[PDB]
Design brief:
Layout (H helix, E strand, L loop, with lengths): L17 H15 L9 H6 L13 H13 L17
Length: 90
Amino acid sequence: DKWTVQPIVLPEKDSWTVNDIQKLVGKLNWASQIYPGIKVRQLSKLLRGTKALTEVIPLTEEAELELAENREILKEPVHGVYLEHHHHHH
């Protein structure tokens, strides 16, 4: 390691509420632009289930499948010494 993105990580439980899914879909979304292979097509659909921010929504086979594969990708560096702008000191 040297310098690049940050350690993008998320919790893991079998009781994701709309509020928990919502925040997630946002993480995977932003992460998507910072991590490929991530999917947020089925994750967002889960919301269509309920609106209450206290409604426990489970992850569908395809939702838990992608989420998993995602949490794994975040293990990549993405960025790291590959820009070189302008600096001279030592």
